[PDB]
Amino acid sequence: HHWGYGKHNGPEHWHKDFPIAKGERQSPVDIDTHTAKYDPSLKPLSVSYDQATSLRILNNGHAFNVEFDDSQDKAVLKGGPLDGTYRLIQFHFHWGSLDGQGSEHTVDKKKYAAELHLVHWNTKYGDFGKAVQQPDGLAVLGIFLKVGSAKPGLQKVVDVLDSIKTKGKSADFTNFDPRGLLPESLDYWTYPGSLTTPPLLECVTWIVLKEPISVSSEQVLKFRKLNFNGEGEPEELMVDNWRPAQPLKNRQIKASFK
Numbered sequence: 207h208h209w210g211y212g213k214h215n216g217p218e219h220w221h222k223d224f225p226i227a228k229g230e231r232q233s234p235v236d237i238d239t240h241t242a243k244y245d246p247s248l249k250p251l252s253v254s255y256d257q258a259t260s261l262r263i264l265n266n267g268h269a270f271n272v273e274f275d276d277s278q279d280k281a282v283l284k285g286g287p288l289d290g291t292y293r294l295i296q297f298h299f300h301w302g303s304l305d306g307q308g309s310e311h312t313v314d315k316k317k318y319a320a321e322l323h324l325v326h327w328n329t330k331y332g333d334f335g336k337a338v339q340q341p342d343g344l345a346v347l348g349i350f351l352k353v354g355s356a357k358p359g360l361q362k363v364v365d366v367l368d369s370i371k372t373k374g375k376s377a378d379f380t381n382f383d384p385r386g387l388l389p390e391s392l393d394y395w396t397y398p399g400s401l402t403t404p405p406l407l408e409c410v411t412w413i414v415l416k417e418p419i420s421v422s423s424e425q426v427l428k429f430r431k432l433n434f435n436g437e438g439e440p441e442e443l444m445v446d447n448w449r450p451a452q453p454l455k456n457r458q459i460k461a462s463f464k
């Protein structure tokens with residue numbers, strides 16, 4: 207039927223509806239730290255989220271998205287490998303059923319418990335729908351989560367999850383500050399890639415931070431109580447909503463740090 211993360215509709219099946227799944231710049235990938243090349247030409251990452259306007263949180267049946275007002279330059283990503291200004295439209299996470307898996311990117315084959323994706327689109331293309339049709343249309347900032355101490359800036363997200371348990375549920379989520387989800391360092395790896403879910407469009411400049419954030423076991427346990435299904439349908443826990451690493455093919459991962 208329609209795509210997902212189960213035995214019968216999971217990542218190994220996606221290529222039948224989305225042939226680009228076997229394309230030349232698919233994501234995620236394994237980041238081989240010893241093979242990534244330090245690029246001294248990479249500019250400092252500029253994360254400008256002080257005027258962010260969060261609107262809503264939505265369970266879309268695959269993950270949950272915290273959506274932002276992207277009709278003005280309010281929360282933007284610039285610099286690093288990017289040319290121009292990319293506006294924040296939403297963030298979401300991928301996570302595991304167990305602490306030993308859940309991230310999409312891996313680092314020297316290591317899987318983290320989850321991965322945060324802050325999705326931005328290039329303002330020169332006018333809107334998000336146009337941007338995903340362009341090779342430099344999106345910039346996604348990826349941040350690994352490990353289980354340890356709680357992340358205080360994540361708790362407001364965790365506490366609203368009871369109100370969006372099932373597919374199609376949304377709730378107001380204003381005045382949330384995404385700066386509270388960032389690690390101390392903005393050192394990153396970067397490569398050209400794709401959306402990690404269908405339609406798997408090859409429109410993403412990936413910027414993956416070296417430094418993970420820590421979240422508590424209670425925080426990630428609350429992610430795993432979410433449902434892929436809609437209300438009134440058979441319950442399937444929303445866990446392991448990650449795509450495994452894809453072949454790097456003709457790409458070099460660049461590092462901003464030595």
Ligand SMILES: NS(=O)(=O)c1ccc(NC(=O)Nc2ccc(F)cc2)cc1
Nearest residue numbers: 323325338346400401402403404405407
């Ligand atoms: N996991 S990821 O690469 O960050 C990502 C980000 C956004 C989407 N897709 C999305 O938000 N909307 C969308 C809808 C229709 C399209 F044709 C393309 C994107 C999928 C994966």
Ligand SMILES: [Zn+2]
Nearest residue numbers: 299300323402
């Ligand atoms: Zn994602």
